[PDB]
C-alpha cells in the first residue's frame, strides 16, 4: 500500500526517491533583463535633484 | 537621425560570371572636422535648444537609444529588399546572398555555455568598486 | 546540413556518409582545411571535429523565405528591447 500509494517504483528491486532537484541551468537572460532595470534605477536616483 | 555626408570613389570590377568588366562606385568612410577659427562661430550660433545633459545623462542617450534606432532602420531596409525578390526583381547576385549567410553565421554563439561563468565574474568585480 | 546549434560531428558519421575507412578521415579533413574552404579544429582524443565556418553557396527562391522569416522576428526583438530602456529611464532624458 505504501509502495503503490507513494512513489519509488520497485522495478529492479530498487526503491528510488528523486532527491537531486538541481534545475536552474545557465540562464543569463533573466539577469540580462532585471539587472538592466536595477542599474537604470541606480543611475536614476543619482543625478536627479533631491 | 543620421549624418549628412557620404563619400564615393570610382573603380573597375572583374566578375566570376564572365560578365564584362564593370565601372562602378566604391564606399569611403567620412567624418566632420573642425578649425578653431570656425567653432567659435558655430558655438556663437548654436543658440537653438538644450544639450549637454552632463555625464551619465548624455552617455545612455548618445550611445544606447540613438544606437538601437539606427540598427533597427538597417534591419528594416534589408527586410524590404528581400521582398522584391518575390518576382519583383531578379536576384541581383549570389554575392549578396553569400554575404547575408556570413552575417547570420557569424553572430555570437548562444549565450548558453561556460561563457556565463566568465560573465558573472566581471559583473561582480564591476559592481564591488561601485 | 546540420543546424548551427551543433555543427559538430564524429568520425563514424563522415566515414559512413562518404564510405571511406575511418583511419583515412583525418587526412581528408586536413585536406579540406588546407585548401581553405572550411575552418575549425579537430579533437582527436574522442574522435570529434568542430567546423565553425563554411563556403557560401547559391540557393533557391524558397529557401530565402527562411531568411526573411528569421530576420523578421529578429527585427522585432530590437524594437521590443528599445521600448524598455526608453521608458524606464524616461526622467533622465526622454
Q: Share of helix among residues of chain A?
A: 40-55%
The main β sheet of chain C shows up as: 3 strands, antiparallel
Q: What share of residues of chain C is helical?
A: 40-55%
Measure the end-to-end span of chain C.
47 Å
PDB class: cytosolic protein
Keywords: ubiquitin-proteasome system, cytosolic protein
Entry title: Cryo-EM structure of human 26S RP (Eb state) bound to K11/K48-branched ubiquitin (Ub) chain composed of four Ub.
Chain A: 26S proteasome non-ATPase regulatory subunit 8
Description:
The structure is cut from a larger assembly and holds chains A (50 residues), B (130 residues) and C (94 residues). Chain A has 50 residues and is mainly alpha-helical. Chain A has 2 helices and no strands. The longest helix of chain A is centred in the C-terminal third of the chain and has 19 residues, at 29-47. Chain A starts with a helix and ends with a helix. Chain B is mainly alpha-helical and 130 residues long. Chain B has helices spanning 36-45, 56-84, 94-106, 115-129, and strands spanning 7-13, 22-28. In chain B, strands 1-2 form a two-stranded antiparallel ribbon. In chain B, a hairpin with an 8-residue loop joins β1 (7-13) and β2. Chain C is of the alpha+beta class and 94 residues long. Chain C has 3 helices and 3 strands. The chains are: A mainly alpha (50), B mainly alpha (130), C alpha+beta (94). The interface between B and C is medium-sized, with 29 and 26 residues. Chain A: This is 26S proteasome non-ATPase regulatory subunit 8.
Amino acid at each position: 500500500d505504501y509502495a503503490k500509494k507513494r512513489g519509488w517504483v520497485l522495478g529492479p528491486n530498487n526503491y528510488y526517491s528523486f532527491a537531486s532537484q538541481q534545475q536552474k541551468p545557465e540562464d543569463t537572460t533573466i539577469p540580462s533583463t532585471e539587472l538592466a532595470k536595477q542599474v537604470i534605477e541606480y543611475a536614476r536616483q543619482l543625478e536627479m535633484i533631491v | 537621425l543620421g549624418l549628412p555626408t557620404e563619400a564615393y570613389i570610382s573603380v573597375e570590377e572583374v566578375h566570376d560570371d564572365g560578365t564584362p568588366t564593370s565601372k562602378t562606385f566604391e564606399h569611403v568612410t567620412s567624418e566632420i572636422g573642425a578649425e578653431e577659427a570656425e567653432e567659435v562661430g558655430v558655438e556663437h550660433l548654436l543658440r537653438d535648444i538644450k544639450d549637454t545633459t552632463v555625464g551619465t545623462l548624455s552617455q545612455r542617450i548618445t550611445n544606447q537609444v540613438h544606437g538601437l534606432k539606427g540598427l533597427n532602420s538597417k534591419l528594416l531596409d534589408i527586410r524590404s529588399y528581400l521582398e522584391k525578390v518575390a518576382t519583383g526583381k531578379l536576384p541581383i547576385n549570389h554575392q549578396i546572398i553569400y554575404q547575408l549567410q556570413d552575417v547570420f553565421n557569424l553572430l555570437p554563439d548562444v549565450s548558453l555555455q561556460e561563457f556565463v561563468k566568465a560573465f558573472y565574474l566581471k559583473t561582480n568585480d564591476q559592481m564591488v568598486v561601485v | 546540413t546540420r543546424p548551427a546549434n551543433h555543427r559538430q560531428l564524429t568520425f563514424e558519421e563522415i566515414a559512413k556518409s562518404a564510405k571511406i575507412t575511418v583511419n583515412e578521415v583525418e587526412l581528408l579533413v586536413m585536406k579540406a582545411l588546407s585548401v581553405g574552404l572550411v575552418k575549425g579544429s579537430i579533437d582527436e582524443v574522442d574522435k570529434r571535429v568542430h567546423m565553425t565556418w563554411v563556403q557560401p553557396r547559391v540557393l533557391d527562391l524558397q529557401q530565402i523565405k527562411g531568411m526573411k522569416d528569421r530576420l523578421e522576428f529578429w527585427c522585432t526583438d530590437v524594437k521590443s528591447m528599445e521600448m524598455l530602456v526608453e521608458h524606464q529611464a524616461h526622467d533622465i532624458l526622454t
